[PDB]
Amino acid sequence: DVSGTVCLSALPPEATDTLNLIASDGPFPYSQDGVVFQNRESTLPTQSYGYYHEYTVITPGARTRGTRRIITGEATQEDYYTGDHYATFSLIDQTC
């Protein structure tokens, strides 16, 4: 299940950075960035393998990738933000 929508401006500034890197198709800071997201738990809508990809949303001070990510969907303007390590997701609205 998706936890509604959220304006880009209401997410950490790093979320905006990640989306800009995605728009330029990288380069990305972490190797895991750009790999396929399997949606193994079916938290997001059911789609074929490869429809989703995951990208890191840097957490200030973290030595690791942290718990924040943006999952892209192949559809136009389809992006999901998770701040709790894939537990919940919110559709990102880049228009606000």
PDB file of C-alpha atoms in Angstrom:
ATOM      1  CA  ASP A   1       0.000   0.000   0.000  1.00  0.00           C
ATOM      2  CA  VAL A   2       1.174   3.522  -0.818  1.00  0.00           C
ATOM      3  CA  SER A   3       0.936   6.170   1.897  1.00  0.00           C
ATOM      4  CA  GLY A   4      -0.569   8.979  -0.163  1.00  0.00           C
ATOM      5  CA  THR A   5       1.399  11.720  -1.897  1.00  0.00           C
ATOM      6  CA  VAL A   6       3.894  14.291  -0.639  1.00  0.00           C
ATOM      7  CA  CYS A   7       5.302  17.497  -2.103  1.00  0.00           C
ATOM      8  CA  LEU A   8       8.966  17.430  -3.042  1.00  0.00           C
ATOM      9  CA  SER A   9       9.431  20.619  -1.013  1.00  0.00           C
ATOM     10  CA  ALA A  10       8.241  18.774   2.103  1.00  0.00           C
ATOM     11  CA  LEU A  11      10.937  16.102   1.817  1.00  0.00           C
ATOM     12  CA  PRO A  12      14.581  16.445   2.909  1.00  0.00           C
ATOM     13  CA  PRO A  13      16.614  18.606   0.482  1.00  0.00           C
ATOM     14  CA  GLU A  14      18.617  15.496  -0.371  1.00  0.00           C
ATOM     15  CA  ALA A  15      15.499  14.069  -2.019  1.00  0.00           C
ATOM     16  CA  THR A  16      15.669  16.925  -4.513  1.00  0.00           C
ATOM     17  CA  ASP A  17      19.358  16.159  -5.118  1.00  0.00           C
ATOM     18  CA  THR A  18      18.598  12.512  -5.865  1.00  0.00           C
ATOM     19  CA  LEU A  19      15.867  13.415  -8.350  1.00  0.00           C
ATOM     20  CA  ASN A  20      18.245  15.800 -10.127  1.00  0.00           C
ATOM     21  CA  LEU A  21      20.826  13.034 -10.447  1.00  0.00           C
ATOM     22  CA  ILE A  22      18.142  10.727 -11.811  1.00  0.00           C
ATOM     23  CA  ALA A  23      17.177  13.390 -14.365  1.00  0.00           C
ATOM     24  CA  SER A  24      20.794  13.519 -15.564  1.00  0.00           C
ATOM     25  CA  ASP A  25      21.040   9.734 -15.361  1.00  0.00           C
ATOM     26  CA  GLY A  26      23.835  10.003 -12.817  1.00  0.00           C
ATOM     27  CA  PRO A  27      26.585   9.723 -11.941  1.00  0.00           C
ATOM     28  CA  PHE A  28      25.403   8.535  -8.526  1.00  0.00           C
ATOM     29  CA  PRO A  29      27.277   8.445  -5.179  1.00  0.00           C
ATOM     30  CA  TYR A  30      26.472   4.823  -4.271  1.00  0.00           C
ATOM     31  CA  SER A  31      26.863   1.666  -6.358  1.00  0.00           C
ATOM     32  CA  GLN A  32      23.392   0.454  -5.371  1.00  0.00           C
ATOM     33  CA  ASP A  33      21.949   3.525  -7.104  1.00  0.00           C
ATOM     34  CA  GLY A  34      20.060   2.606 -10.244  1.00  0.00           C
ATOM     35  CA  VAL A  35      19.708  -1.107  -9.560  1.00  0.00           C
ATOM     36  CA  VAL A  36      16.301  -2.719 -10.031  1.00  0.00           C
ATOM     37  CA  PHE A  37      13.896  -2.552  -7.099  1.00  0.00           C
ATOM     38  CA  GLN A  38      12.023  -5.855  -6.929  1.00  0.00           C
ATOM     39  CA  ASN A  39       9.123  -4.654  -4.778  1.00  0.00           C
ATOM     40  CA  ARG A  40       9.466  -8.102  -3.229  1.00  0.00           C
ATOM     41  CA  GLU A  41       6.919  -7.345  -0.500  1.00  0.00           C
ATOM     42  CA  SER A  42       4.375  -5.972  -2.979  1.00  0.00           C
ATOM     43  CA  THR A  43       4.175  -2.721  -1.023  1.00  0.00           C
ATOM     44  CA  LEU A  44       4.078  -0.855  -4.338  1.00  0.00           C
ATOM     45  CA  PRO A  45       1.670  -1.659  -7.207  1.00  0.00           C
ATOM     46  CA  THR A  46       2.374  -4.953  -8.979  1.00  0.00           C
ATOM     47  CA  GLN A  47       4.549  -4.467 -12.069  1.00  0.00           C
ATOM     48  CA  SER A  48       6.945  -6.558 -14.132  1.00  0.00           C
ATOM     49  CA  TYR A  49      10.594  -6.963 -13.115  1.00  0.00           C
ATOM     50  CA  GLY A  50      12.550  -3.832 -13.996  1.00  0.00           C
ATOM     51  CA  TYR A  51       9.658  -1.391 -13.732  1.00  0.00           C
ATOM     52  CA  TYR A  52      11.118  -0.051 -10.476  1.00  0.00           C
ATOM     53  CA  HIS A  53      14.642   1.131  -9.629  1.00  0.00           C
ATOM     54  CA  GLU A  54      16.032   2.366  -6.310  1.00  0.00           C
ATOM     55  CA  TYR A  55      18.207   5.372  -5.510  1.00  0.00           C
ATOM     56  CA  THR A  56      19.813   6.566  -2.300  1.00  0.00           C
ATOM     57  CA  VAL A  57      18.657   9.748  -0.590  1.00  0.00           C
ATOM     58  CA  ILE A  58      21.720  10.688   1.443  1.00  0.00           C
ATOM     59  CA  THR A  59      21.288  11.049   5.201  1.00  0.00           C
ATOM     60  CA  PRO A  60      23.608  13.775   6.569  1.00  0.00           C
ATOM     61  CA  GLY A  61      26.440  12.294   8.628  1.00  0.00           C
ATOM     62  CA  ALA A  62      25.641   8.671   7.795  1.00  0.00           C
ATOM     63  CA  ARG A  63      28.519   6.276   7.083  1.00  0.00           C
ATOM     64  CA  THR A  64      26.047   4.014   5.272  1.00  0.00           C
ATOM     65  CA  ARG A  65      23.187   4.466   2.788  1.00  0.00           C
ATOM     66  CA  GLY A  66      20.865   5.126   5.704  1.00  0.00           C
ATOM     67  CA  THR A  67      17.114   4.524   5.549  1.00  0.00           C
ATOM     68  CA  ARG A  68      16.040   7.032   2.879  1.00  0.00           C
ATOM     69  CA  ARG A  69      15.442   6.164  -0.768  1.00  0.00           C
ATOM     70  CA  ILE A  70      13.545   7.149  -3.878  1.00  0.00           C
ATOM     71  CA  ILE A  71      12.033   4.335  -5.919  1.00  0.00           C
ATOM     72  CA  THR A  72      11.325   5.260  -9.524  1.00  0.00           C
ATOM     73  CA  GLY A  73       8.477   3.726 -11.489  1.00  0.00           C
ATOM     74  CA  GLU A  74       8.777   3.613 -15.272  1.00  0.00           C
ATOM     75  CA  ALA A  75       5.609   5.678 -15.727  1.00  0.00           C
ATOM     76  CA  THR A  76       5.958   9.427 -16.261  1.00  0.00           C
ATOM     77  CA  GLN A  77       6.573  11.370 -13.054  1.00  0.00           C
ATOM     78  CA  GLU A  78       6.180   8.232 -10.919  1.00  0.00           C
ATOM     79  CA  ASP A  79       8.525   8.345  -7.925  1.00  0.00           C
ATOM     80  CA  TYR A  80       8.176   7.029  -4.380  1.00  0.00           C
ATOM     81  CA  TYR A  81       9.916   8.230  -1.242  1.00  0.00           C
ATOM     82  CA  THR A  82      10.658   6.031   1.754  1.00  0.00           C
ATOM     83  CA  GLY A  83      12.255   7.360   4.910  1.00  0.00           C
ATOM     84  CA  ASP A  84      11.932   4.168   6.934  1.00  0.00           C
ATOM     85  CA  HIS A  85      13.978   1.657   4.949  1.00  0.00           C
ATOM     86  CA  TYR A  86      11.276   0.444   2.521  1.00  0.00           C
ATOM     87  CA  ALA A  87       8.605   0.096   5.237  1.00  0.00           C
ATOM     88  CA  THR A  88       6.296   2.796   3.863  1.00  0.00           C
ATOM     89  CA  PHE A  89       6.225   4.814   0.634  1.00  0.00           C
ATOM     90  CA  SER A  90       4.693   8.098  -0.492  1.00  0.00           C
ATOM     91  CA  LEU A  91       4.262   9.240  -4.083  1.00  0.00           C
ATOM     92  CA  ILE A  92       6.451  12.305  -4.693  1.00  0.00           C
ATOM     93  CA  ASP A  93       4.843  15.349  -6.315  1.00  0.00           C
ATOM     94  CA  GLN A  94       7.545  17.428  -8.018  1.00  0.00           C
ATOM     95  CA  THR A  95       5.086  20.249  -8.765  1.00  0.00           C
ATOM     96  CA  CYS A  96       4.982  21.441  -5.151  1.00  0.00           C
TER      97      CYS A  96
END
